[PDB]
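Dissemination and training. As part of the outreach component of the grant, students in the summer workshop were shown how a complex can be specified as a set of sequence lines and then modelled as a single object. The example used during the hands-on session is reproduced here so that future cohorts can follow it. Participants entered these lines:
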Amino acid sequence: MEVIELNKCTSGQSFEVILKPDPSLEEIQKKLEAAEERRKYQEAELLKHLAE
Amino acid sequence: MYTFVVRDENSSVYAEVSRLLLATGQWKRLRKDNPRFNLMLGERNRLPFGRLGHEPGLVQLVNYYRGADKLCRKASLVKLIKTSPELSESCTWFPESYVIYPDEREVFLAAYNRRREGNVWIAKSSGILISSEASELLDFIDEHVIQKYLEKPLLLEPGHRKFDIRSWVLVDHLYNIYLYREGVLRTSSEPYNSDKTCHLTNHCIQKEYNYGRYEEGNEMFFEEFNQYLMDALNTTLENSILLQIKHIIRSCLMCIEPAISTKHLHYQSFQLFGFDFMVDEELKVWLIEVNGAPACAQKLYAELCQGIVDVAISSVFPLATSIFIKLHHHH
Amino acid sequence: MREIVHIQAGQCGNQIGAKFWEVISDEHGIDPTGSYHGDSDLQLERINVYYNEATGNKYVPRAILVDLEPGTMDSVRSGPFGQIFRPDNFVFGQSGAGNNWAKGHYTEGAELVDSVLDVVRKESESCDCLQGFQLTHSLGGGTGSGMGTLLISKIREEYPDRIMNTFSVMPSPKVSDTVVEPYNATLSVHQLVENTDETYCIDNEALYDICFRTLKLTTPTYGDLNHLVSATMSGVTTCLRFPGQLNADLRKLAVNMVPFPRLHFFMPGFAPLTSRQYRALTVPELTQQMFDSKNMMAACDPRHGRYLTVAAIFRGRMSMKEVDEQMLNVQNKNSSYFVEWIPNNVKTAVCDIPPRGLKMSATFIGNSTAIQELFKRISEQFTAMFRRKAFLHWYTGEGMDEMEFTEAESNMNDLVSEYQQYQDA
Amino acid sequence: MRECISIHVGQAGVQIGNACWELYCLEHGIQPDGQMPSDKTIGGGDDSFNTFFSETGAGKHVPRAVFVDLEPTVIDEVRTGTYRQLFHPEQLITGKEDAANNYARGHYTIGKEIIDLVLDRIRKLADQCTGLQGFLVFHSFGGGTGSGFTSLLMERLSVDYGKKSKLEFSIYPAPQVSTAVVEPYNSILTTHTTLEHSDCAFMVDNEAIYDICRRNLDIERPTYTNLNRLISQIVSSITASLRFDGALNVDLTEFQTNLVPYPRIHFPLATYAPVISAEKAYHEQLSVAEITNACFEPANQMVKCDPRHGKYMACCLLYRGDVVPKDVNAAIATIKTKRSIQFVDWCPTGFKVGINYQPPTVVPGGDLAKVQRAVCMLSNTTAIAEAWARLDHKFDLMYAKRAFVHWYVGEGMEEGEFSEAREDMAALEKDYEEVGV
Ligand SMILES: Nc1nc2c(ncn2[C@@H]2O[C@H](COP(=O)(O)OP(=O)(O)OP(=O)(O)O)[C@@H](O)[C@H]2O)c(=O)[nH]1
Ligand SMILES: Nc1ncnc2c1ncn2[C@@H]1O[C@H](COP(=O)(O)OP(=O)(O)CP(=O)(O)O)[C@@H](O)[C@H]1O
Ligand SMILES: Nc1nc2c(ncn2[C@@H]2O[C@H](COP(=O)(O)OP(=O)(O)O)[C@@H](O)[C@H]2O)c(=O)[nH]1
Ligand SMILES: [Ca+2]
Ligand SMILES: [Ca+2]
Ligand SMILES: [Ca+2]
Ligand SMILES: [Mg+2]
Ligand SMILES: [Mg+2]
Ligand SMILES: [Mg+2]
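and obtained this result:
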């Protein structure tokens, strides 16, 4: 049981008690544009199907 | 209508309980992976306690205590007694034991030399070697916990033979500790030669390596054992042994109660335990091990399983003289 | 504002459609003249989903009325709420479809579909954010079945990213007009399988039985059958018409109810179905009735299959704590009838405003694999005639050939098989 | 003084955000119009409350917050609510159609078309910060916008604000209030994509809050308003160290330092006490030892789990009210023996303690009784992995049959992202096991 780093102020106090010793912008755009492309491809096939 | 699932097809006990639950006309068995259950008769190993208590509107009960393995492992029990102040290393009813990683080798040697300075030990783990030489035991492990071998066991007569006592204990969700009235002695059909068929009282050893000569299946029940004590030793099972057993059972379970209790938990637990006791010629009881998934003597399956339904299952899920002794403990 | 465009086509579609607007118009306080006369703010909360606002605070249903003969639509214009519908949104022909799918889909319907799509385009163009369309029709006739599915195909082509939902009346020999109904129903089911996201299967066989057995109507009429459908249509659209959290729009409903694209045919159910009625029902009673087959209008037995997803809606001032308890009771008692590989597939909603003439009610929406019985029933009737090519001339005279019938039957047999495989998973 | 920006995504984040800023204004004595009498520095200053509130020449203290939702109905509550005068129009962003409980819709389809607008609005707040610590992101796991758009935004924030800390307040799905069957999919999809971009995330399971409301507050059928008032209290105790004078958790970086030794395991468990029904005429006032003990009762945790069967990597105690260090040390010593507290060997066995003297603020007319002292404990225990396993199991059952998968593929997502997300969660579960057992 040890108490360390006791700090006191008007609002309160704190202390420590010891009881025992990323992807780039370009890569994000590719992901989003790739997904948009797959959506556009699937819609085109549907419209092609409806055209038939 | 209550529902339950079965996740351990190899449980002789809860197979009977499953049979009884259906025989009440008020319990419905579900698929083993159906999560909308009231009761789980779960698997021994890797029971998913983390998926219990998260079904809205379902009171869920399981037949195992998470963390009870600490009491049901050769090394876990050994460490538990030493490091638990409630049990202490000065524990008088537990044989001197050490954990040897294939570590407490140094401490075991310190006592071993101090003894030779009865010095026989038995090494076992989860294949047993009983040797009077530390070399044979230590080498056997590396090829486990070394425990003192009781060189002065109480031998039944006629037969001059060794035995052990199996006690079944049921702990319910409220953490009441129930001791089944009916115990069993697993006697050795062979005379105690101080070969291992007479030193080891395991049922398989007796039925594999004089079996059945003295008692049916080397199983002597309490009434016969009690009569023998009255005749041979002018005493009773209750006074000479049974008080020490209830003290040992209560101490072990009270010790871990704060760690495994489900008093304010999102699911409830109960569990049946098998305690193994050794009795020495001074009529002192010794704790050998605690079984987490014990079987039962065939004659005692019906009474015990019904009692499990009565106090453990029907207490949480009610239907439309007690066979247990309630070891009254404190919070 | 997420608007829904309503289309009702053919005799059955227009009679059921007219009753639907009569029902919900009352629930929202809208009178036959289009003027709001309600007392609760919940009424006007999401009124824009089904109604447009006009000059003088008039509310005009966003409904398009379609038929190839003026008969039924003349009745609507003279019906109770005939004056509430926008006159422009009446689109009708004169030839009729003669209970012929080919006429509604290929010859007579094709001549009129474009002027219908012009009206649809006009409603959609003024939608702040259109969510999709709902269609009311029968599958057994010629206009609702044949032209209705033609409209769906053309709506999907022009609005491929919007939700398509239909209320579809399944034919039954017990309530039949012509022997060719199985032919027309089979041809439509394939259209529905491909081009709708959500289809409420309303079986006239179930509606008749409920009227005869439960409601104690000796000689049910089409009006009596439509009384059940109006009540059901009100219940299943409550989540769209009033404030709430669950299935608030068509797309979210589809996501919760349709685990596989082709298996999107729902069994509706309504409770109570009391005959002559002042006695209030308890929450346990509403729940048990709601899950009983006798309250379901698809003429399938749920215990013969398994539920993939279930939506329950409770209306009226009741104990919500008790509603959750009763719903949890039903699932836990009969857990063998809910597939184990979709956890928590039962979603419950509650609406304060009850339906007219009831203190509380429950509406059931189930995606059960038992629906394969309804498609099996149609498949048997179709095949009985098709093996002998009976009555086919009515269709080959309009340009169809037998191969199209063979595919339609084969496609529906596949649908039944797909329902069977997931019932054993 | 360094500013913190709050971002609220989806219905759950927005409604929770409104509840917190209602509490913040009460705690800092800020009226709904934004005026703050106790602030003598009109139109400026680097006081502690300026971390969350900027100031205008008129004297209005404007929250450093942005609300974003793909549907306008929820953010319209803020526009016309009690604290409507607090925010300005640029801070509220709404679309016209939501993600329909579909992660792919929120992330790719709708998110791609609205992300740049959100970032631009955040840039406006960032440019008004002398030194920006980072962001606090509030959102649900199960919602399509909460899961899908948040993961996109977190990625972009890591790009445009690379050196800034990002903390999460996440709502874990619970069927008793869940609105969709595919919530397990969205939870795992967003956790996988967000895992590398969040320095510290606080998970709140709606199941736990729901039971605490029914049991402690005697609420038969708790609603979102009940749930959010309680959640805002826990959030307030977590963020108080950033808004008041103090020496513990004074900046977002310190949250990582004190609670997350392993970057992947950055989900501290929160336990709060006491929760007292305001309907009680007179309430017994619990002591420091009593509330400190309640921090080890599973029934008071934000996520139901059993820490007794896990290992601790860090523990922090945040006290508000009449608390003095002497009583804290006595309570800790008492519990440190009786209670089952098992640390890991590669961490110190200690507690970082923070005391704020102002007792918890109760929203007038709320469900929580005004208490004289409360505590929130932040403990990074492996027991919280039970929540991941529960979620992962439900994911497995639906994904074995590919149930609902077509909805995500239809939005442009590849089916492989399902398995890739699941394998990550399997790795995450392994990480917890390697540290706790
Ligand atoms: N605690 C709490 N949970 C909420 C609240 N609102 C929604 N939730 C939970 O959030 C999940 C649904 O996600 P939402 O945030 O509503 O969805 P969303 O972010 O708006 O995204 P969309 O699908 O586009 O609507 C469910 O699990 C709800 O239980 C709230 O106000 N408080
Ligand atoms: N320390 C000791 N002193 C004396 N005999 C001992 C002993 N440890 C074990 N034995 C004997 O050896 C036998 C086997 O011991 P042990 O309990 O390890 O087998 P086991 O664990 O399989 C019991 P069970 O079959 O109930 O699980 C005991 O029944 C007892 O007769
Ligand atoms: N429930 C109900 N079913 C109807 C109604 N009118 C017709 N039907 C059914 O619809 C089928 C006939 O189709 P119908 O709508 O008359 O053909 P259409 O006018 O060409 O679209 C038959 O199965 C009838 O049983 C009605 O008012 N209510
Ligand atoms: Ca013509
Ligand atoms: Ca100032
Ligand atoms: Ca980062
Ligand atoms: Mg053993
Ligand atoms: Mg007709
Ligand atoms: Mg939303």
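The CA atoms of residues 132 and 307 of chain C lie 26 Å apart. Students were then asked to discuss how this feature might be tested experimentally.
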